Design an enzyme around this catalytic site. Structure first.
Site, PDB file in Angstrom:
ATOM      1  N   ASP A   7       0.679  -1.398   0.080  1.00  0.00           N
ATOM      2  CA  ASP A   7       0.016   0.203  -0.117  1.00  0.00           C
ATOM      3  C   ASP A   7       0.924   1.306   0.087  1.00  0.00           C
ATOM      4  OD1 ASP A   7      -1.927   2.132   0.793  1.00  0.00           O
ATOM      5  OD2 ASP A   7      -3.038   0.512   2.002  1.00  0.00           O
ATOM      6  N   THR A   8       1.046   1.708  -1.109  1.00  0.00           N
ATOM      7  CA  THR A   8       1.642   3.148  -1.345  1.00  0.00           C
ATOM      8  C   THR A   8       1.217   4.207  -0.548  1.00  0.00           C
ATOM      9  OG1 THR A   8       0.810   3.420  -3.577  1.00  0.00           O
ATOM     10  CG2 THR A   8       3.023   2.321  -3.487  1.00  0.00           C
ATOM     11  N   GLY A   9       0.043   4.045  -0.233  1.00  0.00           N
ATOM     12  CA  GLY A   9      -0.795   4.923   0.364  1.00  0.00           C
ATOM     13  C   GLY A   9      -0.618   5.251   1.886  1.00  0.00           C
TER      14      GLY A   9
END
Ligand SMILES: O=C1N(Cc2ccc(CO)cc2)[C@H](Cc2ccccc2)[C@H](O)[C@@H](O)[C@@H](Cc2ccccc2)N1Cc1ccc(CO)cc1
Lengths: 99, 99
Positions: free
Chosen positions: A25-27
Site C-alpha cells: 500500500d503506497t498510500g
C-alpha cells in the site's frame, strides 16, 4: 518482481512465526496488521483513515519477511480489516512505483 | 517516472477544470476525492476503510488528467482527508509496482 494493479497487490509475509497475506500500500505511511499475538511490549497509538480513527498498538523493531526479503521496523497491530504494508517497510524492500 | 517511497507519492491532477494534488494509492480499489464541484449525475455509495464507513457520491466516466496522462473513469467524491488515486485509474495510466 513487477506487479501490475489489475488485481490487489497481495504478498506473503512471515511475522511472529506466522504466515499472513498483506496488501502492498503506497498510500499508507506505516504498516498495520490485524490483531496478532506479538511478543512483547508496545505503546498505544491512534491512526486515522477514511471513516475515522483506530487505536493501535505500536511495536518497534519487528522482523518481517515479505516475499523473500527481510526487514525490521515498526508495525501497528489493531482492528484493521486487513494487513497493510506501508511505506516504512516498502522502502526497505526497495519497492518503487513506475508509470 | 519511477517514484521511490521515502516520500508520500503525490501527483498533480486536473479534474473538472480544477487543479489538485493526489496520493497514488495501490491499496485503494477506487479513486476518492475530497468534496469538490463536479457536474453530472451521480449515485450515492458507501465505502469502508480503517476507521469506518463513509458515504460518497459516485460519478462515472469522469475525465482526469494525472500528471500528463488522461484517464476516464469512476470517481467517488466525499469526506476523505486526501485525494486518493486507486487502482481503477492507476491501471489506465500503466502504473506498475516493482521490487
Ligand atoms: O483508510 C485507508 N487508509 C488509511 C490508512 C492510514 C494510515 C495507515 C498507516 O500509516 C494505514 C492505512 C489509506 C488511505 C488514507 C490515508 C490517509 C488518510 C486517509 C485515508 C490507505 O492508503 C488506503 O489504501 C486504504 C487502506 C485500506 C483499504 C481498505 C480497507 C481498509 C484500509 N484506506 C481505505 C480506503 C478504502 C477504499 C478506498 C477506495 O476504494 C480508498 C481508501
Amino acid at each position: 518482481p513487477q506487479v501490475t494493479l489489475w488485481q490487489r497487490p497481495l504478498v506473503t509475509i512471515k511475522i511472529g512465526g506466522q504466515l499472513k497475506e498483506a496488501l502492498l500500500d503506497t498510500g499508507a505511511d506505516d504498516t498495520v496488521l490485524e490483531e496478532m499475538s506479538l511478543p512483547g511490549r508496545w505503546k498505544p497509538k491512534m491512526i486515522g483513515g477514511i471513516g475515522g480513527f483506530i487505536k493501535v498498538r505500536q511495536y518497534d523493531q519487528i522482523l518481517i519477511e515479505i516475499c523473500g526479503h527481510k526487514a525490521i521496523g515498526t508495525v501497528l497491530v489493531g482492528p484493521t480489516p486487513f494487513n497493510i504494508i506501508g511505506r516504512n517497510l516498502l522502502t526497505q524492500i526497495g519497492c518503487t512505483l513506475n508509470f
